[PDB]
């Protein structure tokens, strides 16, 4: 995640193993139950896309759901690209590039790039955009997996 250091700057720090394991354990115990979404939300505080793929990729089991989510993440990403067209002409030397759906999904962007966008002024909340897609896709799952 990207956290504030004592000095008063935003720097990246790694997520903790008993945080990781707590994510694992939630999924083990409460599967598709709604409490998973606030839980997720708390444990995703200050998290990167990269950390969010890590969390999704580290799941075991419920592979039908994991595939449905993936496909929702790509749909929501396809929709990001649709709604926000690429911008006019070449990229400025003085500036950094606008993200695509795949940069938001973490796929085409690097960590330093993910830190550029979030730490820069104005900052862009690429975590929160992926977060809604995850929560939206979580609703899809919850609604389906209701019996």
């Amino acid at each position: 995640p990207i956290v504030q250091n004592l000095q008063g700057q935003m720097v990246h720090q790694a997520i903790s193993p008993r945080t990781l394991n707590a994510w694992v354990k939630v999924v083990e115990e409460k599967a598709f139950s709604p409490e998973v979404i606030p839980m997720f939300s708390a444990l995703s505080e200050g998290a990167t896309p990269q950390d969010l793929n890590t969390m999704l990729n580290t799941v075991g089991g419920h592979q039908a759901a994991m595939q449905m989510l993936k496909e929702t993440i790509n749909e929501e990403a396809a929709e990001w690209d649709r709604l926000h067209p690429v911008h006019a002409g070449p990229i400025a030397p003085g500036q950094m590039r606008e993200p695509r759906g795949s940069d938001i999904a973490g796929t085409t962007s690097t960590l330093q790039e993910q830190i550029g966008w979030m730490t820069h002024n104005p900052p862009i909340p690429v975590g929160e955009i992926y977060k809604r897609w995850i929560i939206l896709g979580l609703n899809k799952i919850v609604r389906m997996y209701s019996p």
Binding site: P34, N139, V142, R143, S146, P147
Partner: protein, 74 residues
């Protein structure tokens, strides 16, 4: 399971049923106004005859602590 399929048993305490209701209501994502409509309507409707009778005597305007204490002996 659908919200319409939530019903109170003939021997089931209301309390255990109301818990089931706001759990399933917790998995419904509808507008608040619709969920208010579901609250006043469906809860009583699928409540058992003995408690149903009881709840009819509370009239309208009733709140959950009073419903929950009203159907306790049933």
């Amino acid at each position: 399971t659908s919200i319409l399929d939530i019903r109170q048993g003939p021997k089931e305490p209301f309390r255990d049923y109301v818990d089931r209701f706001y759990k399933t209501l917790r998995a419904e994502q509808a507008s608040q106004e619709v969920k208010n409509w579901m609250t006043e309507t469906l809860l009583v409707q699928n409540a058992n005859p003995d408690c149903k009778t009881i709840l009819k005597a509370l009239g309208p305007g009733a709140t959950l602590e009073e419903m929950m204490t009203a159907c306790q002996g049933v």
